[PDB]
Symmetry: D2
Subunit: 233 residues, 4 copies
C-alpha cells in the first residue's frame, strides 16, 4: 500500500546515510522527492527514478537563508508543493570542550538547527494552504546519554526537540504534524541495547513513513527513539 502517493517530500541531507534511505523509502511509498544537499546525489536520483517517481536534487547549503529561499522556490515551481519536510541535514564532529571554539559552536547550530527553521519558513505556507503537512526532524539518542566531546552537538540535537515540540503547537490547527526521530549509533558511509545489533539506515525508514502517513495524523510534538531499546524516555 502506497501511503504517500502523490505527496511531495523534501529531504535535506538526502545524498547519503539516513537521508538517502528515507528518501528512497518514501519513493517506494509513492512520493516524489526533492533533495537538498552540499554534494550531488547520483545514487539517490538513480534509485528514485527506477521506482517510477519524480526526483529533484540541488546543491544547497541548508544553513544559508539565500540557498534555502532559492531551493524553496525551485521546489514550488518544479512540483508546485511540499507536503512533507524531513530535516535530516546535520554534522556531528567529536570535539573536546577545551578545543571547542565559538566559531565551531555557531557553525554547528547554523547547520543542525537553523536549517530546520529556514526550511519550515519556506514550506509551511504551502502546507497551510492545502490544510495538510508533515514535518519530521532528526535528533539523536545522545541527548539522553553520557558521552564526552559533544557539547556543541548535543546542544543542537536538543534544540531540534524543542523546535519539534513548539512548532507542533503552532501548526496543530492547520492539519500539520511536527515530530522527531532519534536514531542510535547508525552505520552510514561516514559514521547496552535490548536488541543486540548495530543500527542501519533502513531501521529508521519504517518510523519515518509511519509518521508521514494518515496513521499518525493525531501524533504531533513527539520524539520517537529508534535505537534497539537502549534509551528509555
Amino acid at each position: 500500500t502506497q501511503r504517500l502517493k502523490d505527496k511531495l517530500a523534501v529531504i535535506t541531507g538526502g545524498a547519503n546515510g539516513i537521508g538517502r534511505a528515507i528518501a528512497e523509502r518514501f519513493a517506494v511509498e509513492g512520493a516524489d522527492i526533492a533533495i537538498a544537499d552540499l554534494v550531488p546525489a547520483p545514487e539517490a536520483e538513480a534509485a528514485i527514478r527506477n521506482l517510477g517517481r519524480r526526483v529533484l536534487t540541488v546543491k544547497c547549503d541548508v544553513s544559508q537563508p539565500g540557498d534555502v529561499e532559492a531551493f524553496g522556490k525551485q521546489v514550488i515551481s518544479t512540483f508546485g508543493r511540499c507536503d512533507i519536510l524531513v530535516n535530516n541535514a546535520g554534522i556531528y564532529p567529536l570535539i573536546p570542550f577545551d578545543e571547542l571554539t565559538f566559531e565551531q559552536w555557531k557553525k554547528t547550530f547554523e547547520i543542525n538547527v537553523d536549517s530546520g527553521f529556514l526550511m519550515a519558513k519556506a514550506f509551511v505556507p504551502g502546507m497551510k494552504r492545502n490544510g495538510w503537512g508533515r514535518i519530521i526532524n532528526l535528533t539523536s539518542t545522545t541527548y539522553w546519554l553520557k558521552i564526552e566531546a559533544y557539547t556543541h552537538y548535543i546542544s543542537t540535537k536538543a534544540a531540534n526537540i524543542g523546535f519539534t515540540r513548539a512548532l507542533a503547537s503552532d501548526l496543530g490547527k492547520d492539519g500539520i504534524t511536527v515530530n522527531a526521530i532519534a536514531p542510535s549509533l547508525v552505520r552510514t558511509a561516514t559514521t547496552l541495547q535490548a536488541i543486540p545489533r548495530l543500527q542501519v539506515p533502513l531501521d529508521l525508514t519504517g518510523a519515518a513513513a509511519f509518521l508521514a502517513s494518515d496513521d499518525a495524523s493525531f501524533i504531533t510534538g513527539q520524539t520517537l527513539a529508534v535505537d534497539g531499546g537502549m534509551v528509555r524516555h
Copy 2:
C-alpha cells in the same frame, strides 16, 4: 497484509480502543482472540465480516486460573500467539482519603497483573518461534496533574516500567515490547463517566490538535508497532494524544 498468517490476543477487546485495535489487526490479515469480562458480539461480527477468524472468551485477565485456561483455548484453536495487546484496565475516580487498600490492590490486579499473567502464557511460544509483539496500553495521565487517581496512575506507570523491563528481557528473542499512551479518548465508558466533562475542554485547550480523540486515532500506531517497520523499536512509550504531552 502486514499481519497475514498471524494470531493476535487482545484483552479488553470487546469495546472502545481494544475493539478498534482488534478490528484493525484483522483488516491487516490477522486472526483474533479476545479476552474480556463482557461479550464481544459486535467485535466478532466485524472481524468475521472481514474474512478472518475470531475467538471471544469471557475471562478475568486478573485471575491466574482464567488466563491459563484462556491460553490453552487459544493454542488448541489457532495454534500460537504472535501479537499480545494488553489493553484491559479500569480507572474509577477515587480520593486518596477514601481509597482503601482493597480498591488499591484490585486496581493493580486488573491493570498490572493481567499484563504479567498474559505475557507468561504467550511469551514462550513467541520465543520458541523467534518472533513476537507485546503492546501495552498506558495513559498520558502519567505526565499530568490530575487528582483522585493515585491508584490508577501508579498502575499506568507500572505498565510503562513493565514495558521497559520486559523489552530488555526479550530483546534477543525477536520480540519487541512497547506501550501506547492515549489522551482522553471517546468511548462508551468515558462518555458515561465523569471525564465526559472534559470532552470539550481538554481537546481544544491543552492539545495541539483541537479535536476529541476517537479509537481510530490509535489503530495506526498499534498496527505500526506490531509490524516489521518497528522491529528495531522496543521499550518505548508512544503518546498518541494530539500533542498534549511531550516526553
Copy 3:
C-alpha cells in the same frame, strides 16, 4: 536545624540509604521512627548520640496490620509524623522465564503497597496540621537497559507514578510528594549481591562522575526536599547518580 521539632518516619532505615537518611535528618534536628524487618542498633545509637530521640520497630511494611500497629506506636510516642521516607524495598535478580506470579506479587507488596499503606497512616496527621513531606525511593534502572528485573523495575516505575499522583492529591494541603533515584549505591546488601561486579565498571564508565556512589551522596538531596527550600517542588523525581541518566 532545618528539621527542628519534627518527626520523621523512615522505612528500611536500619542499613544503607535509609539509615544514612535517618542519621542526616537527626543531625538537622529531627526525631526518628524507623520501621524495618531487622533490628537497627547501629542506627539508634548514632541518632541518640546526636541528641535526638529514636524509635525502632520490627515491622513488615507490606502488611496492613503491622503498618497500622506501627502508626499507633509512633503517635503515642512522638505525637505526629511530619516527614515520611518510603525507602523499604527488595531487588532480587530473576529471569522472566523463571519469574512466578508469587514472586511478582510479593515484590509489589514490599516495594509498592508499603508506600501506600504508610501514606494512609500518616497523611491524615500531616493534612490536619497543614504540613508534610513524603519522599519515595525509586531507581535509575527505570531508564536503563538491564535484564532479569521486570518485577523490580515495574515496581520502581509504580513508585514514580505513586509520587506524581499523590502530589496532585495533596498539593493543596501543604504537603509535597517527591522521589529520589539513586545509581548503583555501595551498601551491605549490594556488596554481597550480584551487582557487586559493576562496582568498578558502571561508575567510571557510564557515569559523568567516575566514583562509586555511597549513602552520604543521597542525604543532601533528601534533607533538601524535606525542607522549606523545596516547598514549591512536588511530584518530581530527582536522580542522584553521578550524571548517568538524563530525563
Copy 4:
C-alpha cells in the same frame, strides 16, 4: 549555615527577577557576587552590600564574545576566581511563527544559548584549576507544555538542557557539576498546578543554593522542575 562562604558566584541577568533573587540568596549563603547585565543593578548591589558580601556589577551584553571575554577578565582580576556560574540571562517575547523572522530567531539564540557557552569558556578554566565548580543553567517548563508563539523561545530552552547534559559529561571528572532549573510562569517585574499559587522568584532560590552546595556534588546533568507540581518528567 553558610554553604557558599568564600565562593565567588557569577550571575548573568542578575539585575532583576530570578537572577536578582538568586544573587541575593547566594549572598545570604556567604558568597560574593559578580553580576553581568545590560542595565545597572542598583537594587542588587545595595541588597548584597547590606549582607556584608562583595559585589561587582557590569553593563555587559552576554551575547557578545567581546563583552563576555572582558567581563571574564574583570571578574578574575577583581576576585581572582569564579566558583559558581549561573546562566540566567534570557528573553521570552511571544511571537507567532508566521511573524518570526530569521533575525529574531538568531537573536533569541545568541542571548539565550550563546551566552551560556561564552561564559562557560571564560570560567571553566579556573574551576578546573581549583578542581571545583558549579554551573547552573536556567531553562523553562514550557519545554514540556503545549503553548503557541514560542518556537524560537522553546527551541533555545531545550538547547539549554542539552548544553547542561553534555557539558556535564565533559567536566564530570574535574569536580564540576552542571545542572539546570526549569521554573514555571514566575512573577517578575517584567513577566493546572498541584500547588495552587502563582510562582515568585524566591521559589527558585532554594533549589539554586542546594545545587551550588556540597549536598549536590554527586548531582550533575539534571534538570530540576520547580513549578508547583505542574510538569512531570
